[PDB]
Amino acid sequence: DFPRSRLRFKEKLGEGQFGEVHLCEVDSPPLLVAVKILRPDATKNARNDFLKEVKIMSRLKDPNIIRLLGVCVQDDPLCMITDYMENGDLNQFLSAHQLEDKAAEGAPGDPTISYPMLLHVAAQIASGMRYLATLNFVHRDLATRNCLVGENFTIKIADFGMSRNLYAGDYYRVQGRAVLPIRWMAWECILMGKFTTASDVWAFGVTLWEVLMLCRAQPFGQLTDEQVIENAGEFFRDQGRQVYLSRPPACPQGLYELMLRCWSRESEQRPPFSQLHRFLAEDALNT
Ligand SMILES: CNC(=O)CN1CN(c2ccccc2)C2(CCN(C(=O)c3ccc4n[nH]cc4c3)CC2)C1=O
């Protein structure tokens, strides 16, 4: 529907396995947008993956999920258009802030963030996930690296895939197998390969941990990949030897207990996103 000639390409925002994303200016109904196009080395298989992503993205209509603003008309070279999220991925964003020392002592733009803003960030992710659940849409790779930050701490969940070198340490790779974000994965995912809304809740638990850590350390960071995979086996055997992420310094005990529930052995005992969102938006403000 959208004429490609109306785009003015400005800078490269990233590249993935089957496309790359550029910052563009538009003059028509200057707006900035993010535009995904085929890579220069695009193959028949990459174009197929691109077209399928267009179809997947057409499903997703929520304030806290990446939205498809437009696509280029059939004549033109393929493209997808979305909102420009000026503050980049959430992991880099939080890494550049520290928790405020005294409440409301700073100015806008300061490298500090409040505990209630951390809740606001996490609640938005929870709201996005709540939406995906109503679609029976399973994400499979929720993490702060896959969220984007706009103006005024607005958050949108994306899905970059697994090829950014910056996050290569977050994925476990074996020749001929799917690439796996094991440190964010529920035990039943690691052992049995099956991904559900309930395993997305588990990943949300780890993502919430990340947010409260201000992304200062990797989940299970002092443990090897092999040890993390063995931990899943300890969940299975249920002999009380499994281990969990520790309580972040910015996280009160009440919120941490909620976090722990996301990592329940039984999928059905993990809180739904509706419950997670309510806690983050309201209960977590309790003294
Ligand atoms: C929920 N599934 C998805 O979101 C899948 N999708 C679809 N999608 C997309 C991108 C453009 C147009 C249409 C769709 C992306 C968004 C994030 N990506 C970026 O490279 C990126 C980087 C910095 C940015 N700043 N502002 C916006 C930015 C975008 C990877 C591609 C993605 O993960």
Side-chain angles (χ1 to χ4, degrees):
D1 255 35
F2 189 80
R4 186 185 165 106
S5 61
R6 316 280 195 80
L7 303 173
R8 292 159 34 84
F9 286 77
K10 283 313 177 177
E11 85 173 72
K12 189 176 177 175
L13 296 177
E15 61 178 16
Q17 55 186 284
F18 56 80
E20 62 184 44
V21 176
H22 290 259
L23 174 65
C24 291
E25 296 192 346
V26 194
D27 307 76
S28 309
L31 180 56
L32 296 177
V33 289
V35 177
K36 182 161 179 174
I37 58 174
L38 291 177
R39 297 162 53 102
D41 60 13
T43 65
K44 174 184 158 195
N45 297 342
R47 170 179 190 267
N48 177 244
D49 286 340
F50 192 100
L51 290 171
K52 266 201 298 200
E53 184 172 50
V54 175
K55 288 184 173 185
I56 299 169
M57 296 310 302
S58 79
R59 302 182 56 189
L60 305 185
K61 289 166 280 186
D62 185 84
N64 293 121
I65 306 294
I66 297 295
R67 60 175 177 149
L68 197 61
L69 293 189
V71 300
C72 294
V73 292
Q74 56 173 33
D75 290 351
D76 303 11
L78 294 184
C79 92
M80 281 184 274
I81 309 179
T82 190
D83 306 89
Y84 178 49
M85 305 294 286
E86 62 177 10
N87 283 313
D89 89 47
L90 179 60
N91 188 284
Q92 291 191 245
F93 183 80
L94 283 184
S95 296
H97 292 78
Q98 42 193 2
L99 186 78
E100 79 179 359
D101 187 349
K102 283 81 181 178
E105 181 199 316
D110 272 25
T112 62
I113 194 172
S114 75
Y115 172 65
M117 184 63 76
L118 295 179
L119 297 176
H120 175 58
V121 168
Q124 287 178 77
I125 296 160
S127 188
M129 293 305 291
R130 181 178 49 188
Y131 170 76
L132 294 185
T134 70
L135 295 191
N136 295 311
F137 185 101
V138 180
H139 191 286
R140 292 196 186 202
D141 198 6
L142 181 60
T144 60
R145 68 182 172 269
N146 271 326
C147 298
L148 285 169
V149 187
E151 303 177 346
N152 296 291
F153 297 88
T154 53
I155 307 293
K156 283 177 170 276
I157 302 167
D159 191 355
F160 279 75
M162 315 166 149
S163 76
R164 286 171 297 176
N165 296 330
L166 186 56
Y167 299 115
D170 291 351
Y171 297 95
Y172 177 74
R173 296 180 174 89
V174 170
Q175 171 92 303
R177 296 189 197 167
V179 182
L180 298 178
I182 51 167
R183 290 158 195 272
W184 284 257
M185 285 164 66
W187 71 270
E188 74 268 11
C189 299
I190 293 181
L191 295 189
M192 303 193 298
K194 274 163 186 175
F195 292 80
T196 65
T197 300
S199 61
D200 273 352
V201 171
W202 182 298
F204 178 80
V206 179
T207 302
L208 176 55
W209 181 87
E210 284 182 279
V211 169
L212 292 167
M213 293 288 292
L214 280 86
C215 301
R216 283 311 197 269
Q218 192 196 41
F220 296 118
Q222 298 303 97
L223 299 179
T224 75
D225 290 346
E226 288 63 39
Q227 287 179 311
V228 167
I229 290 162
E230 184 48 35
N231 194 42
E234 291 288 0
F235 275 100
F236 175 66
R237 293 187 279 285
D238 213 12
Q239 300 162 357
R241 319 196 211 287
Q242 68 285 3
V243 300
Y244 307 83
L245 295 170
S246 295
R247 187 178 63 193
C251 182
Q253 176 59 29
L255 184 49
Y256 182 60
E257 293 177 2
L258 185 71
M259 283 180 26
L260 291 177
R261 284 188 33 69
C262 295
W263 304 322
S264 297
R265 186 191 187 271
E266 315 303 327
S267 293
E268 64 272 12
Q269 298 173 16
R270 300 180 197 156
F273 285 109
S274 64
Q275 179 183 152
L276 289 165
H277 182 271
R278 164 171 290 276
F279 195 97
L280 289 163
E282 302 298 332
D283 295 64
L285 301 171
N286 284 1
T287 292

